[PDB]
Amino acid sequence: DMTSQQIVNDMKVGWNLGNTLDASPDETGWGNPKTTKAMIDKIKEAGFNTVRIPVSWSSHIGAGPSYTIDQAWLNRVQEVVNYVIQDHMYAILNTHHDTSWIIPTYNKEAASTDELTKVWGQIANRFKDYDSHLIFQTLNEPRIVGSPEEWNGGTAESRDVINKFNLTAVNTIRSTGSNNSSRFIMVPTYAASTATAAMNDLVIPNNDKRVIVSLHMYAPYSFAMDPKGTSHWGGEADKDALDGQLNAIYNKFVKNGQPVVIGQFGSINKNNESSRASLAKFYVSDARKKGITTVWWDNGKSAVGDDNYGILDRNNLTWVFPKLVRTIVN
């Protein structure tokens, strides 16, 4: 009987198993160890209630027109889903670095739609009997790689085609029955962008009451993502800018009865844990006041500088940034 907003609130706060099943050609390909139950237990013990499990399917899909997903890969994905589910957390299962075959142009739409139907049909069938703690996310950051608008919310054409892709995925999921008839489903804007036009052009498939919007927002960019940007965050201007961004999401979606999960946020290590914790504390608390649940991007990289978003050392089961983790889960 739960509503989408009740689900989002129950999810509380999440952690991404990044650079893992989303790596290629296999789980260890980008330097992370094979995931264990003990790693996921650490997540639960810290107080997270959601794990997002990004999965890149491309390397595991056979030739058209069957597009068969390798059974051993599905079996491994299910092992990882089970770590999370057996710990009584929400699991988000997606498609991830799949832009090679998911291409949002009118010219590529028919072929991508067909493959999405075949691929989501197999994923959904395998996972159909899980309860509502398993959430499907149709697409990660669907976009045209290399286009000028890739990180600016796309174009009218690509935003239109993404709506068709999300609709195809939702219909395919629901068509498989069992608990997929009522499973909660996350769908992104173009690139999961918070750009005004990306959010304005999103159409919820079938106006389905069990669809949640997925957005990614590593704000503020210069502090959080840019290795050349400032290493300090705090104070009234920084709070005002972030509150403004969260309020735009609240005003567009949440206030109108459309729930939102920020399925990726985070900051890189600039030897600046205090600033990173100040940011996370404000981000998570202000998002929650606006009904929005957040999910930290952890790629297993905790050295200093570019792309080091990891906060758990998976190899020795140690939280590297203990003040930061505590601000995320409080």
The number of C-alpha atoms within 13 Å of 204 and in the hemisphere containing its C-beta is: 18
Candidates 23-31, 72-80, 227-235, 299-307; binding stretch for Cl ion (CB under 5 A) = 227-235
Between residues 233 and 296, which has the closer beta carbon with respect to Cl ion?
A: 233
User: How many degrees, rounded to 5, is the angle at CA 299 between CA 267 and CA 89?
Assistant: 95
Q: DSSP state, 254?
A: G
Closest distance of CB 283 from Cl ion, Å: 16
- Looking at 30-38, 228-236, 245-253, 270-278, which segment touches Cl ion (CB under 5 A)? 228-236
CB closer to Cl ion out of 200 and 230: 230
**Which candidate, 280, 278, 286, places its Cα nearest to that of 298?**
280
Kindly give, in sequence order, each residue whose CB lies less than 8 Å from that of residue 45, ignoring residues fewer than 6 positions away.
none
Rounded to the nearest whole angstrom, what is the least distance from the CB of residue 238 to Cl ion in the complex?
6
Query: 148 vs 235, which CB is nearer to Cl ion?
Result: 235
For the chain, the 3-state helix, strand and coil shares in percent, each to the nearest 5, are 45, 15, 45
Give the contacts of 55 (CB within 8 A, at least 6 positions apart).
Answer: 21, 22, 77, 93, 94, 95, 96
Q: Rounded to the nearest whole angstrom, what is the least distance from the CB of residue 246 to Cl ion in the complex? A: 18
Tokens of 88: 């009584």
Q: Applying CB under 5 A, which part among 103-111, 136-144, 230-238, 297-305 lies near Cl ion? A: 230-238
Show the CA angle centred on residue 217, arms to residues 200 and 108, nearest 5°. 55
What values do phi and psi take at 163, rounded to 5?
Answer: -60, -40
State the Cα–Cα distance between residues 203 and 166, nearest whole angstrom: 9
Which one, 178 or 222, has the nearer CB to Cl ion?
222
DSSP state of 61: B
Cβ-closest position to Cl ion: 235
- Name the one range near Cl ion by CB under 5 A: 98-106, 231-239, 270-278, 299-307: 231-239
Least distance to Cl ion from the beta carbon of 236, Å?
5
Q: Give the shortest CB-253-to-Cl ion separation in angstroms.
A: 29
Q: Which residues have C-beta within 8 Å of that of residue 157, sequence separation ≥ 6?
A: 104, 105, 106
Residues 286-305 that bind Cl ion (CB under 5 A): none
Task: Using the minimum distance from each CB to Cl ion, give the nearer residue, 239 or 326.
Answer: 239
Q: Using CA atoms, how far apart are residues 162 and 104, in angstroms rounded to an integer?
A: 6
Name which of 45 and 236 has its Cβ closer to Cl ion: 236
Number of residues in contact with Cl ion under rule CB under 5 A? 3
Burial of 117 (0-12, 13-18, 19+ CB in 10 A): middle
Site for Cl ion in 233-262 (CB under 5 A): 235-237
Shortest Cβ 276–Cl ion spacing (Å):
17
Residue 28: CB minimum distance to Cl ion, A: 43
Site string for Cl ion, 112-141 (x = CB under 5 A): ------------------------------
| Shortest distance in whole angstroms from residue 194 CB to Cl ion | 22
3-class SS of residue 231:
coil
Residue 65 or 235 having the CB closest to Cl ion: 235
Are 35 and 73 in contact by the 8 Å Cβ rule? The answer is no
Q: What is the DSSP letter of 190?
A: G
Could you tell me the smallest distance in angstroms from the CB atom of residue 5 to Cl ion? 33
C-beta closer to Cl ion: residue 6 or 222: 222
By beta-carbon proximity to Cl ion, the closer residue of 1 and 236 is: 236
Which residues of the shown chain bind Cl ion in the complex (CB under 5 A)? 235-237
